[PDB]
Enzyme design. Structure first.
Site, short mmCIF file in Angstrom:
data_model
loop_
_atom_site.label_atom_id
_atom_site.label_comp_id
_atom_site.label_asym_id
_atom_site.label_seq_id
_atom_site.Cartn_x
_atom_site.Cartn_y
_atom_site.Cartn_z
N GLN A 233 -7.38 -1.79 9.75
CA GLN A 233 -8.39 -0.98 9.95
C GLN A 233 -9.46 -1.22 8.75
O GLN A 233 -9.32 -1.78 7.79
CB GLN A 233 -8.01 0.68 9.63
CG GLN A 233 -7.23 1.16 10.81
CD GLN A 233 -6.66 2.52 10.80
OE1 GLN A 233 -7.23 3.23 9.68
NE2 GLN A 233 -5.73 2.86 11.30
N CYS B 181 3.39 5.62 5.54
CA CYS B 181 3.45 4.63 6.46
C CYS B 181 4.93 3.98 6.78
O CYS B 181 5.39 3.80 5.67
CB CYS B 181 2.70 3.38 6.10
SG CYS B 181 2.16 2.06 7.01
N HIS C 199 -5.27 5.69 1.55
CA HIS C 199 -4.39 4.48 0.95
C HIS C 199 -4.72 4.20 -0.48
O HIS C 199 -6.08 4.37 -0.82
CB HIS C 199 -4.69 3.32 1.66
CG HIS C 199 -4.33 3.29 3.09
ND1 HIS C 199 -3.27 3.16 3.83
CD2 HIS C 199 -5.17 3.61 3.93
CE1 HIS C 199 -3.45 2.91 4.85
NE2 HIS C 199 -4.77 3.42 5.36
N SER D 257 -6.35 6.34 9.47
CA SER D 257 -4.83 6.74 9.26
C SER D 257 -4.58 7.57 8.04
O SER D 257 -3.57 8.18 8.01
CB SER D 257 -3.81 5.24 9.16
OG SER D 257 -3.88 4.65 10.34
N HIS E 189 0.78 -1.19 0.17
CA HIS E 189 -0.03 0.06 -0.05
C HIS E 189 0.76 1.21 -0.07
O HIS E 189 2.06 1.15 0.25
CB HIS E 189 -0.84 0.21 1.31
CG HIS E 189 -0.27 0.26 2.41
ND1 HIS E 189 -0.85 1.09 3.39
CD2 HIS E 189 0.86 -0.23 3.05
CE1 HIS E 189 -0.11 1.12 4.45
NE2 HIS E 189 0.93 0.27 4.27
#
Length: 150
Positions: free
Chosen positions: A118, A100, A144, A141, A46
């Site tokens: 998540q 990330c 993505h 977060s 990702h």
């Protein structure tokens, strides 16, 4: 007729048909197909773009994320376009630009099951088929892009 999440749509801007997955947010011109359920485990890479409203607005790329959610979406949309054009590669972009820590592994998260990531990220990951890329996936977060590798 179509696989899970997929629907035939038309753009409001132009009267042009495309296919859209309402779980992964992927869009494409190609029809996505010409008792199986979903896989029990998947492996994904990702690219995360964080924003000021991310749970933790910081990353290895900048200790203070200040961009707006709209600005993060613009970046995500630009990365999607570069990947689809062939001008850039997913893993390369993830290694350079993902917020990330998984960027250290070129975006690879390894294999995972449901209940571990998540919820929107998990839903999109398990709806991708091997080799497919999501559209923008919105999570606590940040936003993505997800590539299912196994």
């Amino acid at each position: 007729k179509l696989p899970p999440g997929w629907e035939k749509r038309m753009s409001r801007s132009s009267g042009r048909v495309y296919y859209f997955n309402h779980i992964t947010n992927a869009s494409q011109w190609e029809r996505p197909s010409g008792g199986q359920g979903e896989p029990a485990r998947v492996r994904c890479s990702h690219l995360l773009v964080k924003h000021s409203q991310s749970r933790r607005p910081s990353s290895w790329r900048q200790e203070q994320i200040t961009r707006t959610q709209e600005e993060a979406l613009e970046l995500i949309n630009g990365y999607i376009q570069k990947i689809k054009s062939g001008e850039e590669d997913f893993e390369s972009l993830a290694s350079q630009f993902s917020d990330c820590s998984s960027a250290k592994a070129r975006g690879d998260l390894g294999a995972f099951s449901r209940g571990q990531m998540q919820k929107p990220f998990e839903d999109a990951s398990f709806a991708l088929r091997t080799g497919e890329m999501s559209g923008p996936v919105f999570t606590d977060s940040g936003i993505h892009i997800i590539l299912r590798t196994e």
